[PDB]
Every structure is written in C-alpha cells, then in structure tokens.
C-alpha cells in the first residue's frame, strides 16, 4: 500500500505549452492541451489517445522535442507511442515486451538516449533504453535487481549520472546510480532509511543536488537530499510536517524556490513553499482550498508561473494557478479520469 | 566592421553559479566564479588557465555538466580547455587543427555531441563535432560553404536541428539549419536580408522559436523572428529603436520575458524589455548608468535575476544585477580585460 496517487501525467512541450496525460473509464489515453503557453490558456478538451492501460500513463519529452507516452499495457508488457515530429500527429501504440508490476519511470541520458524503469514481476529493478539519440530501436531488457515495493522514480545528477529510487522490503527509502553517464554500469541499492508510506518524488535544486520527498510513518511531508552538488552522503531524513492523504507533488518556482504539494486531511489541496530563496527556510502550510480526489499534479509552466492539476468530486480534473496576489480559483477541465495505478 | 564586441563568455554552472571568461594583458584566458548560486554572490577573484589566444574565448557546458572552453590559438588552429569532471580541475589545453578566422560557436546536438562553427581561411563556415557523446576525439573538419562577414552564431530549434546565423557579403543576415538533429546533411544558405552593423545574437522564445537581435544601418536596434515554431518563414525585420555603440545582448526573465542591453551614446548601459509576458509587447529603452568600455553580457542567475557585466573605464569587469526595485548599483569584479576578437 501507498498513499494515493497523481492521476495525471504533465510535460511542458518544446513550444511552451503544458499537456496532460491520463486514463479514461474505458481504459484508454486521454490528453488535454493548453491551446497557448501562457498561464490561463483555453484548453483543448479531453482526446484519446487509445490503447488499454493497465498502469499510470507516463508522458516524456524526447531531445529533439518530440513527446513519448509509456504505459503498461493488458498483457503486461511495457507499450509506448510516439510524436512522429514535434507537436504533430502520434504513432500507433507499440509493445517494447517484458512484464512489469509498476507504472514506467523515464528519463533521458546526456547522448539522448531514453532509459525506462520499472519494476519486474520478480520485483526487482528492470530498465530498457533507446539504442540511439530520441529513436528507436531499443535495447533488450536487463535487471538493477532489487527488491522493491513502490513505483520508481528516476532523475539526473547535476554530472549527468541516472540515479533511481523506490522502496523497499523494509519500507525505508533505497537508491541506485549509474558510475558513468550512458552507461550500463550501475552501483550497487543502498538504503537511505526512514520509512516511507508513499511514493518518492524526486527533483533536482537549482545547486545541482537531488532532493526526494516521501510521506512518512506519521503521515507527515518528509525529505531528504544530496549534501553536495551531485555528490554522496546523503543529509538525514527532515520532516516538513502537515498531515497529507496523498502523495507529495514538487516543483520549482521560476525562482528556483521549491514548492510541495498534498492533499489534506480536509481533503483539499496544501503547499509549503522555501521562502526568500532556493537555499531558503520552509514556510508552514497553507491550504488552496478545493475539495480533490486524487494527489496533486504540480508543473511550472511558460509565464513561470505554479499550475497544479487534481481530480475533484466528479472525477473530472481541475485546475489552480499562481496569479500576483494568491491563486487562482478552481476551473474544470472536464473529462472523467480513473486511476490506474499499477501500485495502490 | 562591427559593432563593439562583447568582452566575456559567461555560462550557467551545472550547480547554479555564474562563472565568466575573458582575455588578459598577457593573452591568456582568465576566469571569475560566484561561489554560490545566487545573486550578489562573492567571487573568485581572477584566475589564469593559461594558453595564448587570438580571438574571444567562448565557453560551453557539455551535457555531462563539464565545462569546455573553445578559442583560436596563435598558430589560428582553433584550440579548447575542458574540465575532467564537472565543476573539477581543467586538462590542458589541446588543438582541435584547422585554420579560423572567427570567435568559434558552439552548440550541443540532441544526442549530446558537441558541435563547433567558425570561420575559415576561405571565409567560408566550417564545423566539427565530437564523434560521441561529451566526449573525443573529435571528427574531421568539413564546410558550410557561405562567404561571411561576422562571427557566427548557433543556437537549436526546438525540434532538434542546429541552425547557423551569420552576416553575408552582402551585409543582410543569412542563415543555415540542420536538416535533421544530429545530421551532417544542412540546407542551403538563404537570406533574410536586412543590413546589419553588428555580429547576429540569437535566443529561444518560450514558445520553441527562434528570434535574432542585431545593429541596423541607423545604429538601432533591430530583431527578426521564426513565425510559428522551428518554422520558416520569418517575420518581417522590426526596429526596436534606441542608438547603440555596441552589439546587443540578451536574456530571458525568469517568466521569460525578453530583455535586450546595448551601450548607448552616452557610453552607459541601455535596456528594453517585453512587458507583461513573453509574447508582450516592448518597453521604451531606460538606462542602468556606468561608462562601459565593451558590449554587456547578460546572463540570468540561479535566483533568477537577470546579472549583466561589461567592461569599465579602468578596464576591470564591472557588473550589475536586478533587485525587487530597480537594479543593483554597478560593482568591480576587478582585473584588466581586453578584447581579443578575431573579427572587429
Ligand atoms: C504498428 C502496429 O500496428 N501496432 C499494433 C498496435 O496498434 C495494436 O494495438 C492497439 O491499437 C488499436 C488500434 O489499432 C487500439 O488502440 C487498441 O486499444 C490497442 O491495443 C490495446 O492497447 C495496447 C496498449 C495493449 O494494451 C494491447 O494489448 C491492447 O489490445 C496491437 C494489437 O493490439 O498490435 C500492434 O502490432
Ligand atoms: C553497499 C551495499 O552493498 N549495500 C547492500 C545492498 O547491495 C543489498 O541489497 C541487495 O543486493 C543484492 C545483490 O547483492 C540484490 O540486488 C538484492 O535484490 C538487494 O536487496 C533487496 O533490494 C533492496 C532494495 C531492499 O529491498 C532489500 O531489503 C532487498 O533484499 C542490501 C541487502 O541486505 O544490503 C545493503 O547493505
Ligand atoms: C470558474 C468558477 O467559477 N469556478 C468555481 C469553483 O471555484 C468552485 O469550486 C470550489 O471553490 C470553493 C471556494 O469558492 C472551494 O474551494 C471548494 O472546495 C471548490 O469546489 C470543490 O472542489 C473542486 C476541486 C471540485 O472537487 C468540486 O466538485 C467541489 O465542489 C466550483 C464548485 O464546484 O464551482 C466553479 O464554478
Ligand atoms: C596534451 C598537451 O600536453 N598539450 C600541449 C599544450 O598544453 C601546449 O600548450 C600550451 O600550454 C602551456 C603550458 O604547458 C601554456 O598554457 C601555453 O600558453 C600553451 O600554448 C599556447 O596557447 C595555446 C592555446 C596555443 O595558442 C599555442 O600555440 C600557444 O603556444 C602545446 C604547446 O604549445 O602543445 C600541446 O601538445
Ligand atoms: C535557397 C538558395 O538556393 N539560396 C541561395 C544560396 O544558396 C546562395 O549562396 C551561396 O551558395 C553557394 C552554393 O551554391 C555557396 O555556398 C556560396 O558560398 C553562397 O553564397 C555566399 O554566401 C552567402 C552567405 C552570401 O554571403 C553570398 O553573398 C555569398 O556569395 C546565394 C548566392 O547568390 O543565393 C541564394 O539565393
Ligand atoms: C559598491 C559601490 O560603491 N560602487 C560604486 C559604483 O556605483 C560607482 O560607479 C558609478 O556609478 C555612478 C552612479 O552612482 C554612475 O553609474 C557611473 O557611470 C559609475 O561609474 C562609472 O562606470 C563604471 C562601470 C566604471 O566604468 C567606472 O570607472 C565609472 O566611474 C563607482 C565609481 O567608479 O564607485 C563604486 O565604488
Ligand atoms: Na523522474
Ligand atoms: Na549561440
């Protein structure tokens, strides 16, 4: 078990727009798109993508720009579909084989190359990547081994080495990384401790360092990071406090000022936000009010501005932004949305 | 001819500080580094890496987070420097061959190989690029073909594909792209006409196009832009007025709002900006005061605060960055730079 899920998947497109990914009743990909990249755009309205997915759909941007959804499909098998050119029309949904027990974690290495992890059926580590820059054909399979119990989660070091985290046996937070960026040599798991109650989120600071953030035991925000730019040790577990029935969302304002987001125990939407700077203390919680289903999608979009999407009442998914003076007040974007979570 | 160079090469490090590079007295290249990843940070002070150089030193970030800085050598091979391991010690410096007769410019490919543009002998462009991925050897040196008249400048689209601006005989701005990303297959030179005074600048809008600021024949400033994303055709050339004794330069706010500096007639620092948003219209121009002795470099910090130097009447590196209210007041970051363009 984990805390609930995000229930939709958000990129920024290389035009500046943001597009939102998720899954319908009939099990199929649903999209909807800001018409411009502007804070408060119309959207396009919800439009499938088809398929039949048996996990969170899970949107990654190719280096030359070109958007690529990953999702477990009926059989089990990692399945994908691709822009054919950026911003234009999509490829048919293509199997990539194997059987995988999580929702797909994507990221891309320093030579273009996209990389997929995702929990096997012997529990462990599996990772598939692109023989080339931004295209197929990809590799075969292979494990990073582990034993894991939530959905992975990948990023970047600031030195360009992937490095993925999950939860393990013990409940606490472990670790791998490549020793060389491209590479297929790995480290070995190791633990960072705590015990974590939802999935880990992971970003990178503006200084250069990973920092995760995971729902403890207490059901309050914790986190924990890199001490050094790209560097080991690790700093200890630090609570950020609240009580949250979901999991956590983060992203950077256009300051670098990172910022959480969670659904309360009053159901509606909260943030802690570092305050003056990136390197700067982290307010108390605040509440963005709504009444929500689902964790909260958090992305920065072209006027630097927060925009944060969550399923509401009516399964439809709904909308706030950051404006001068607070937040924007709740929109609907329609469309009904289901989870689809390989994990719950 | 052209407008008054800038008079260093600044970059973004992979943990969020401003580091700067210039030419000394003794034709070395030296350079100065924030400490930490904010504005109004202390600095290094200046600090030799040597070598003998004959034209501006320009300086690029791998996608591995390595810095590498490319300059032409006093035998006019074009000649680089580049860190071991990010943000580490430097190797020597080493000859990439060939004979140039322009500042070299340097973009990375989708797929992480570098990829260098500079003026030959033939005063044609010619490029070479690392075979893989952040790494040598490098391949040989082919040509663009073209005949031009100022130092080049690359950028990438928003699609993948590297694209070439430069002046022609003619004196018009000229370009030439990449058919492909990664490719060695390019398009002919073509023309987008205008007169220019100036070496071409050239930015990424939020919304994926590429735009191009330069002098005019009238000392204005002029730009000129793609009409949709990573498309032809262009606008049309539009003035942005003001009388300028420098080359321009410019950077995106961090809401991406692009803001233009330039050297007035008074010899103090003259900005314009877009307001509201990036797609906003552009300000009348204002001044930021000092004498200054080069163009201005801007750059935005890891605060994201725009922080622009130039040099000053006592030729030392003077900067000066945005605050809540207005800018700071302009400060000396010391040494004694000249200006080492290989054309001026
Ligand atoms: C290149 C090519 O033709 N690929 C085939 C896929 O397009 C096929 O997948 C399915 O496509 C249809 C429309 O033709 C529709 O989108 C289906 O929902 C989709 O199949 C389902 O969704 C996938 C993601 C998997 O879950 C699959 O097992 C489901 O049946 C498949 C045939 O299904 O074959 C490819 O060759
Ligand atoms: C630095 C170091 O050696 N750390 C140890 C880890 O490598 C160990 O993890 C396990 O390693 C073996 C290979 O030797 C294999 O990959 C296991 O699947 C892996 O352990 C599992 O996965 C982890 C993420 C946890 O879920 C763990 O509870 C599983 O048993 C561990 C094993 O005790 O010790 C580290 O010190
Ligand atoms: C554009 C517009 O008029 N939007 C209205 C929303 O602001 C309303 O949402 C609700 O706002 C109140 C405070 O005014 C409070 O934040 C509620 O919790 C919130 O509504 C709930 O949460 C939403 C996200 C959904 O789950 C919704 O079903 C809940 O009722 C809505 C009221 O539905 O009306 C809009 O017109
Ligand atoms: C791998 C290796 O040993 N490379 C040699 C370079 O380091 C050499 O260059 C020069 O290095 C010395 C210190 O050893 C010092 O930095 C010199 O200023 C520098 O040479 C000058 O600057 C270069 C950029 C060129 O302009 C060069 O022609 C200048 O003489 C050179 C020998 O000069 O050989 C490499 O093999
Ligand atoms: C779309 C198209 O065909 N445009 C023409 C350009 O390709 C031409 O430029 C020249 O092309 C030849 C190869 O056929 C060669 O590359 C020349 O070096 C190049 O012209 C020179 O470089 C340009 C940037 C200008 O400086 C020009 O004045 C030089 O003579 C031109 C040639 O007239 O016409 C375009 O229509
Ligand atoms: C930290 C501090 O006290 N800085 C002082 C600077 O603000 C001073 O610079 C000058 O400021 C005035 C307005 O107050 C005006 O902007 C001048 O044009 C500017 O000084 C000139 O421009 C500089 C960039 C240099 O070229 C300098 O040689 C010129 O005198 C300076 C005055 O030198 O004092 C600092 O202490
Ligand atoms: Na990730
Ligand atoms: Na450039």
Known sequence: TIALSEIVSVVNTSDGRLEVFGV????????????????????????????????????????????????????????????????????????LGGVITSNPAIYANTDGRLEVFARGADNALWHISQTTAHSGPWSSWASLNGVITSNPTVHINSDGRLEVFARGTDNALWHIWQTAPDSNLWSSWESLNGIITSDPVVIDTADGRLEVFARGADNALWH???????????????????????????????????????????????????????????????????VITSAPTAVRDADGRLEVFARGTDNALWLTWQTASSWSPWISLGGVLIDASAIK
Request: charged letters at 10%; glycine letters at 10%.
């Open 224 to 290: 924990i990071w890199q001490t050094i730019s790209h560097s080991g040790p690790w700093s200890g577990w630090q609570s950020l406090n609240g009580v949250i029935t979901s999991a956590p969302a983060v992203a950077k304002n256009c300051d670098n000022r990172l910022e959480a987001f969670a659904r309360g125990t009053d159901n509606a939407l909260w943030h802690t936000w570092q305050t003056v700077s990136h390197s700067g203390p982290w307010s108390s919680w605040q509440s963005l009010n709504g």
């Open 24 to 95: 319908g009743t009939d099990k199929a990909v649903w999209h909807n798109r800001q018409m411009a990249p502007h804070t408060g755009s119309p959207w396009s309205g919800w439009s499938s993508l088809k398929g039949q997915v048996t996990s969170k759909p899970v949107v990654y941007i190719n280096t030359d720009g070109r958007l690529e959804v990953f999702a477990r499909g009926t059989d089990n098998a990692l399945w994908h579909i691709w822009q054919t050119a950026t911003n234009a029309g999509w490829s048919n949904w293509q199997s």
